[PDB]
Design an enzyme around this catalytic site. Structure first.
Site, mmCIF file in Angstrom:
data_model
loop_
_atom_site.group_PDB
_atom_site.id
_atom_site.type_symbol
_atom_site.label_atom_id
_atom_site.label_comp_id
_atom_site.label_asym_id
_atom_site.label_seq_id
_atom_site.Cartn_x
_atom_site.Cartn_y
_atom_site.Cartn_z
ATOM 1 C CD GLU A 178 71.202 1.479 -41.026
ATOM 2 O OE1 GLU A 178 71.747 0.668 -41.454
ATOM 3 O OE2 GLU A 178 70.112 2.047 -41.754
ATOM 4 C CG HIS A 179 76.718 -0.264 -40.450
ATOM 5 N ND1 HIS A 179 77.283 -1.089 -41.338
ATOM 6 C CD2 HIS A 179 75.899 0.355 -41.300
ATOM 7 C CE1 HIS A 179 77.093 -1.116 -42.434
ATOM 8 N NE2 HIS A 179 76.205 0.027 -42.496
ATOM 9 C CD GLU A 222 76.898 -1.904 -45.389
ATOM 10 O OE1 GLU A 222 76.634 -0.866 -45.313
ATOM 11 O OE2 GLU A 222 76.512 -3.107 -44.790
#
Ligand SMILES: CCCCCCCCCCCCCCCCCC(=O)OC[C@H](COP(=O)([O-])OCC(O)COP(=O)([O-])OC[C@@H](COC(=O)CCCCCCCCCCCCCCCCC)OC(=O)CCCCCCCCCCCCCCCCC)OC(=O)CCCCCCCCCCCCCCCCC
Lengths: 443, 54
Positions: A59-60, A136
């Site tokens: 996703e990153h 994160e």
């Protein structure tokens, strides 16, 4: 122009499938602006133990550039057309979508296609994002609510794939290989499992022609056309108590296995969760709030907030509630909460369901407050329910629900069931699984 | 841990364990733990030659 009618007026959602398997769907509005995206049927549930965290690492990178158009090339092209690109990755559903001028409808699809298919996966960037995700995590770890739901899954679905976090392990993030991210993409981001959805001022036909153009996947063997069926996740009446008397408030979440998207009871479950509702210290309502729990919460300063939930999944799900409280009112709160649950199974009143149904419809409508949300409903409906479900239908289904039905269904899923518990913080007051297990009956 | 159900249950179990011997004794060997010398009405003039405390 009564509500009923406005419902049967909303344009139908069109769906057309390609030879590769990709399913294109959309709801056309006059909106000058719009939203289009690809809703893949992949998540951390598809990941196994060795690659837990791939779909998130991936996703990153779906935004750091493709083979054709590298980093700046991508961003520049996208930033400069006043478009917003963004996405997410759940346990069993991943999504990537853009918010652009209905005008750019076709260039966007090209862009979407270029992301799900030709992600650069620049091994240089990979090592950077590795440090970002790791960062994160440090942050998300300070989100009690998250920690609490992850844990909830961690024990309710212990031993299965659904008991993993989406973000994955600190080890996997530290070691995943370009190759891993690579295959993840190849194995999951596949046509028959993806759904190109759009909403706004867009021609379904124009939409699908664009789809044909860049979403030109090929399928030779049967294997490719097939959608795998995941192994069933076993629910377990259990509890996980992560205690830290140093945190200000305590989080508590309790739940029972839910049916799954397909099951019609879900409607009834929602109507029920609609009765108990949710609360929070800034709800103007106050002592007069309709939800007894909320009301009780207010009268006794039982919690900084509470909320019911019915998290659905393909074959399973979690039906429960979560509350944040002070160390010394955790018990009274838990007590009252189970109280209302038992009341749901034994004495729901017609007046309650009436209010509940109205409140529900209202939420149902807010689920389609913009091209993006609408889009999200399409992508998900097709993905989950197979087809699209119109408010006119939902509304229909909802109306069928009545006290008796709520009680039967709730009894069915709640009464005398071994719940799953997750507690975090200064949780000494709330206690004993047994004492809580007995709260599951009589009411 | 809350006394209930942990020790209320443990205690009930305990009671039933003590109850068996107590009743076995009571129902099967009634005077086992008792002196037979006490089946003779008190005689202010004669102390039994064999007199032992409970
Ligand atoms: C029933 C007897 C227990 C059998 C046993 O030895 O368990 C071993 C074993 C359990 O092993 P464990 O998990 O290591 O033991 C846990 C406790 O000892 C498990 O034991 P517990 O804690 O649940 O219970 C202990 C219990 C058991 O007491 C005994 O040890 C006997 O004693 C009491 O509850 C106290 C009441 C005492 C009444 C005596 C009244 C006085 C009158 C004198 C005349 O059970 C079996 O192998 C199955 C037995 C069938």
């Amino acid at each position: 122009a009564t509500y009923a009618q406005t419902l049967q007026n909303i344009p139908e959602t069109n769906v057309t499938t390609l030879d590769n398997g990709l399913r294109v769907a959309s709801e056309e509005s006059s909106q000058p602006t719009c939203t289009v995206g690809v809703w893949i049927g992949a998540g951390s549930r598809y990941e196994n133990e060795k690659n837990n965290g791939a779909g998130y690492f991936v996703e990153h990178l779906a935004f750091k550039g493709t083979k054709k158009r590298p980093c700046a090339a991508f961003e520049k092209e996208v930033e400069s057309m006043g478009a917003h690109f963004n996405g997410y990755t759940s346990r069993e559903q991943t999504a990537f979508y853009i918010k652009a001028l209905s005008k750019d409808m076709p260039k966007v699809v090209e862009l979407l296609a270029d992301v799900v298919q030709n992600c650069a996966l620049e091994e240089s960037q990979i090592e950077k994002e590795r440090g970002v995700i790791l960062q994160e995590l440090k942050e998300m770890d300070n989100d009690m609510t998250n920690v609490t739901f992850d844990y909830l899954h961690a024990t309710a679905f212990q031993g299965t794939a659904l008991a993993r976090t989406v973000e994955g392990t600190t080890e996997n993030i530290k070691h995943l290989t370009r190759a891993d991210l690579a295959s993840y993409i190849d194995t999951h981001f596949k046509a028959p499992r993806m759904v190109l959805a759009a909403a706004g001022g867009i021609s379904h036909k124009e939409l699908v022609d664009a789809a044909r153009q860049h979403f030109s996947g090929v399928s030779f063997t049967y294997k490719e056309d097939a959608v795998p069926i995941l192994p069933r996740c076993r629910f377990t009446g259990s509890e996980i108590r992560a205690r830290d008397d140093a945190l200000p408030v305590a989080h508590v979440a309790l739940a029972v296995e839910g049916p799954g998207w397909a099951d019609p009871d879900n409607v009834v479950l929602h109507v029920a969760n609609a009765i108990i509702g949710r609360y929070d210290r800034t709800f103007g309502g106050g002592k007069h709030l309709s939800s007894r729990l909320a009301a009780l919460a207010v009268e006794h300063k039982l919690c900084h907030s509470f909320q019911t939930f019915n998290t659905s999944y393909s074959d399973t799900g979690l039906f429960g509630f979560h509350f944040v409280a002070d160390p010394l009112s955790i018990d009274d709160m838990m007590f009252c909460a189970q109280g209302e649950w038992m009341r749901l199974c034994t004495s729901t009143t017609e007046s309650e369901v009436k209010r509940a149904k109205n409140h529900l419809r209202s939420a149902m409508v807010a689920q389609l407050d913009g091209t993006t949300p609408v889009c999200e409903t399409i992508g998900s409906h097709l993905l989950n329910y197979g087809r699209r479900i119109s408010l006119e239908e939902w509304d229909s289904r909802i109306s069928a629900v009545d006290a008796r039905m709520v009680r039967d269904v709730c009894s069915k899923y709640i009464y005398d069931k071994c719940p799953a518990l997750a507690a975090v913080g200064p949780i000494e007051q709330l206690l004993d699984y047994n004492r809580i297990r007995s709260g599951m009956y009589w009411i | 841990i809350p006394f209930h159900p942990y020790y209320s249950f443990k205690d009930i179990l305990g009671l039933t364990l003590m109850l068996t011997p107590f009743l076995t004794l009571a129902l099967f060997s009634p005077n086992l733990l008792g002196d037979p010398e006490n089946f003779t009405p008190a005689n202010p003039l004669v102390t039994p030659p064999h007199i032992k405390p409970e």
